[PDB]
Write a protein that binds this ligand. Structure first.
Ligand code: AKG
Ligand code: FE
Length: 258
């Protein structure tokens, strides 16, 4: 029945994360915090407008707002939430910074599944080691509301079985061509309640269901990068125009997790 905090997080949960590449941590945010953070995200959606992850209006996987935490004063306290970010730190076992966050919405009956990938491939960064994502549920997410699934142990893939980095979208390859054994790997669906968080490593292969429920799904994805991460040109780097290749990502836009 009780909250999970950075302090009371079990050694078993940390071991599960290190071995499996993901972990479900329940009850990190209270009902009150969920309500306040969801409302702030709704304000950002209204003010910024959403973007489509997918191939146009008829092939929406996810509606999103990128660098989302920067776009509302109250969202700083989400990405640097003491429990969420403190748990991320314990799981990673190394110093972290906030890279970015996204508002991640799936509308009911109008979404495709989120196509399988690892996050490393689309991060415009060098020097990744312990980088991981906190996928924070701001609504309940039973399976059919667009829940996440993960391939256990896939973060430990050898180099030849990983794509690593896309400089441009022409480099896209089907995961089965990159990782021939992909289709014979188990796939774990992890439904969650609002306020729960699932963390996954930047090499963990993952995906999400279509939302075929009657209710909107909203999560908030926070990418916590290695604290000494540097800039590497790639797809998804439009907001990093002020940087040169190899420059460290530091300062107020990429704050240290303490
Ligand atoms: O919310 C989704 O459907 C996709 C999430 C995702 O890929 C991530 O958090 O890395
Ligand atoms: Fe992802």
């Amino acid at each position: 029945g009780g909250p999970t905090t950075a302090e009371n997080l079990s050694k078993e949960a940390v071991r599960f994360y290190r071995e499996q590449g993901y972990v479900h941590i329940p009850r990190v945010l209270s009902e009150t915090e969920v309500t306040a953070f969801r409302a702030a995200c709704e304000e950002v959606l209204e003010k910024e407008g959403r973007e489509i992850w997918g191939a146009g209006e008829d092939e929406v996987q996810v509606h999103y707002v990128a660098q989302a935490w920067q776009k509302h004063p109250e969202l700083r306290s989400l990405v640097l939430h003491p429990e969420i970010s403190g748990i991320a730190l314990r799981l990673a076992g190394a110093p972290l910074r906030v890279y970015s966050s996204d508002i991640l919405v799936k509308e009911p009956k109008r979404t495709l599944p989120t196509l399988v990938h690892d996050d490393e491939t689309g991060l415009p960064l060098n020097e990744l080691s312990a980088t991981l994502t906190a996928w924070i549920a701001l609504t309940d997410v039973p399976v059919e509301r667009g829940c996440m699934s993960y391939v256990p142990g896939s973060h430990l893939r050898a180099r030849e079985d990983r794509q690593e980095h896309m400089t441009s979208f022409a480099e896209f390859r089907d995961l089965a061509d990159v990782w021939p054994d992909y289709p014979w790997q188990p796939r774990v669906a992890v439904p969650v309640r609002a306020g729960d968080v699932v963390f996954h490593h930047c090499r963990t292969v993952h995906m999400a269901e279509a939302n075929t429920s009657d209710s909107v799904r909203m999560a908030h994805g926070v990418v916590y990068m290695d604290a000494d991460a540097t800039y590497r040109p790639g797809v998804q780097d439009g907001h990093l125009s002020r940087l040169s290749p190899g420059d460290p990502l530091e300062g107020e836009l990429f704050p240290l997790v303490t």
